[PDB]
């Protein structure tokens, strides 16, 4: 997260810290006791870890719950080329113990787009401005969705890549306010409601005006798949 | 087809006439002896007929090879909301008789994106100008590829629907030359190469400058699905 601030320890109990390996981490959201929603491009291995109730990566916290992935459910229509439908569902081998520091983030009751100018927040352990490595403590920044037509104009992504109707832009026309490397998969909340999944921006150009954050919109389509997968398995 | 002309009987032996029902028809392309490529939104029913070597819908022709669909293969990631990935492979119960009036249209070698200004054409038995009734004879129109960026400008689709990198726009800036209802599924030919499949325009406004024809681009992802589907047997 760039241009944000360190949140109050455990003030965002739905945040999931995904420790992929020693060189990369991602974020996610607990949408069910045994289900985590993250980005499809976030690669997991035997060295990865799904941590709940955390604030600091290193610090040993009693609230943390390190869970295991029973099975990965990437969005079948994911297109790694443009990062379309960049969503992946993590089924946990055991139900997370829901409490005050570990809670569920409910899905959007409807999959409607987000109007430009709406205010949204984004949390994560990704890198910041004055740093190259990830942030040890959770951070969040306030941003605003940019009209997707602007998201595609010459001052921005300029059809490279194209931002479709299942994606939202958000950040700042001036920049400085944005999610970075490590925040991928972080749940995008607008006006207090889960609306998207952090997907991508300009490589190494986090916070740069031309690369406002891009999030997968929890549209009707995506929503129907998510719900179908939670109940489809056992 | 609007703004075109009646082709020479059987001068486009690769064209497939899809008689869906009594109220609707579509077009397609014979990409293999027993394989027809058409649009996913073209609905077929028990009494639908895949007519080959046709020119007239009504008139009786000895070059016609009335076929039947053995199984439909719609694009697994086709989105009916945005007509995204609007494609469908039809497997015929029996292979066709390749002759002078019945040919196989070759698949693109590379899933390139046609450059703006390129000359292309489209044939179909769809409706024409001032003549709301579906043409009885096959027709083709010479069209040009319209820059995707322009295809999304305010003076056009204005990012709604949004035309992605997997879709191309062709027709005319001044309008008048465009594919129409009934021409769905028809193959887009550019420089003599199969480059796309007819998908949509503007409801009852084909030929309108504001809404140039949108064609699914035969990109790599799409071509692979095609080549991967045929080989599959079970």
Closest chain B residue to the Cα of A164, Cα to Cα: B162
Give the Å distances, CA to CA, from A219 to A225, B67, B112, B134: 10, 40, 30, 37
Locate tokens 């027993």: which residue?
Answer: B34
**A136 beta partners:** none
CA-based nearest residue in chain A for residue B219: A81
Is there a contact between B81 and A149 if contact means CB atoms under 8 Å apart? no
SS3 label, residue A229: helix
* B43: closest CA of chain A, how far (Å): 21
- CB atoms A162 and B162 under 8 Å: yes
Is omega for the bond preceding A31 within 30 degrees of 0, making it cis?
no
Which residue in chain B has the smallest CA separation from A80?
A: B221
In sequence order, what DSSP letters do the residues of B48-97 get, joined into one string?
-EEEES-SBSSS--TT-EEE-EEEEEE-TT-BTTTTBT--EEEEESS---
Which residues of chain A does B161 touch, with a Cβ-Cβ cutoff of 8 Å? 165
Is A149 close to B164, i.e. CB distance below 8 A? no
Assess contact for B75 and B85: CB atoms under 8 A.
yes
CA distances from B16 to A77, B59, B91 (A): 29, 16, 13
From CA A62, how far away is CA A49, in angstroms rounded?
16
Mark yes or no for CB contact A162/B164 under 8 Å. Answer: yes
Host H or E run for residue A217: strand A213-217
Q: Are B187 and B197 in contact (CB under 8 A)?
A: yes
Query: Could you tell me the two tokens for B105?
Result: 């249209």
For residue B88, give the nearest of B112, B106, B69, B114 by alpha carbon. B69
Tell the burial category of A191 from Cβ atoms under 10 Å away from its Cβ (0-12, 13-18, 19+). Answer: exposed
Can you tell me the distance from the alpha carbon of A38 to that of A30, in angstroms, rounded to the nearest whole number?
9
Q: Let me know: does B173 contact B209? Beta carbons within 8 Å.
A: yes
Q: Can you tell me the distance from the alpha carbon of B182 to that of B114, in angstroms, rounded to the nearest whole number?
A: 24
First to last CA, chain A: 37
What does chain B come to in residues?
234
d(CA A143, CA B89): 44
Strand order in the sheet with B35-38: B65-67, B49-52, B15-19, B25-32, B35-38, B88-92, B69-74
The angle formed by the CA atoms of residues A6, A10 and A16, to the nearest 5 degrees, is 90
- Most A CBs within 10 Å: which of B83, B87, B161, B162, as the mutation test of the A interface? B162
Q: Structure tokens of B159?
A: 């990012």
What is the rounded CA–CA span in Å between residue B135 and residue B8? 14
Positive/negative CA dihedral, B198, B53, B44, B135: positive
| Chain length of chain A | 234
Q: Is A129 helix (H, G, I), strand (E, B) or coil?
A: coil
- A209 three-class SS: coil
Resolution in A: 2.5
Counting one residue from chain A and one from chain B, the pairs whose CB atoms sit within 8 A come to: 34
Handedness of CA B39, B40, B45, B50 (dihedral sign): positive
Closest-approach residue (CA) in chain B for A84? B164
Q: How far apart are CA A164 and CA A159, in angstroms?
A: 10
- How many whole angstroms separate alpha carbon B57 and alpha carbon B50? 12
Domain assignments of chain A as residue spans, ordered by start = 1-12+105-219, 13-104+221-234
List the CATH code of the domain at B1-12+105-219.
2.40.10.10
**C-beta atoms of B82 and A159 within 8 A:** no
The answer to whether the beta carbons of residues A19 and A27 sit under 8 Å apart is no
* Mutation site, A77, A157, A225, interface B, largest B CB count within 10 A: A77
Residue carrying structure tokens 């009987």: B9
Exposure string (b/e) for B138-177, b if CB count within 10 Å is 16 or more?
bbbbebbbbebbebbeeebbebebbbbbbbbbbbbeebeb
Q: Which CATH number applies to A13-104+221-234?
A: 2.40.10.10
Tell me which DSSP letter residue B43 carries: -
Per-residue HEC secondary structure of A160-207 comes to CCCCCCCEEEEECCCCCCECCCCCCCCEEEECCEEEEEEEECCCCCCC
Among the partner residues B79, B84, B159, nearest to A152 by beta-carbon distance: B159
Mind telling me the catalytic residues of B? 41, 86, 184
Chain A residues touching B164 at Cβ < 8 A: 82, 162, 164
Give residue ranges of A with CB < 8 Å to any B CB. 76-77, 79, 81-82, 148-149, 152, 159, 161-165, 220-221
The coordinates were experimentally obtained by X-ray
CA distance B163 to B153: 10
**Coil, helix or strand for B220?**
helix
The alpha carbon of A39 is separated from its chain's Cα centroid by a whole number of angstroms, namely: 7
CA angle B221–B188–B142, rounded 5-degree value: 150
Contacts of A77 in chain B (CB under 8 A): 76-77
Show residues of chain A in contact with B79, CB under 8 Å.
Answer: 221
Q: How near does any CA of chain A get to the CA of B165, in Å?
A: 7
- Of the residues B164, B221, B223, the best mutation for testing chain A's interface (the one with the most A CB atoms within 10 Å of its CB) is B164
Same fold, B1-12+105-219 and B13-104+221-234: yes
């Amino acid at each position: 997260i760039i241009g944000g601030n360190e949140v109050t320890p455990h003030s965002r109990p739905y945040m999931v810290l995904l420790s992929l390996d020693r060189k990369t981490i991602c974020a996610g959201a607990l949408i069910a006791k045994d289900w985590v929603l993250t980005a499809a491009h976030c690669n997991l291995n035997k060295r990865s870890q799904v941590i709940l109730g955390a604030h600091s990566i290193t610090r040993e916290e009693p609230t943390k719950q390190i869970m295991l992935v029973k099975k990965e459910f990437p969005y079948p229509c994911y297109d790694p080329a443009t990062r379309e439908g960049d969503l992946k569902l993590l089924q946990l081998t055991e139900k997370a113990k829901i409490n005050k520091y570990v809670t569920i983030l409910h899905l959007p009751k409807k999959g409607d787009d987000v109007k430009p100018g709406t205010m949204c927040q984004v949390a994560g352990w990704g890198r910041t401005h004055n740093s190259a490595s990830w942030s040890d403590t959770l951070r969040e920044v306030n941003i605003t969705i940019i009209d997707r037509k602007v998201c595609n104009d010459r001052n921005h992504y300029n059809f490279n890549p194209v931002i479709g109707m299942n994606m939202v832009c958000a950040g700042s026309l001036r920049g400085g306010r944005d999610s970075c490397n490590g925040d991928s998969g972080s749940p995008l909340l607008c006006e207090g409601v889960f609306r998207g999944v952090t997907s991508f921006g300009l490589e190494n150009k986090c916070g740069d005006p031309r690369g406002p954050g891009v999030y997968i919109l929890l549209s009707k389509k995506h929503l129907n798949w998510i719900i179908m997968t939670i109940k489809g398995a056992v």
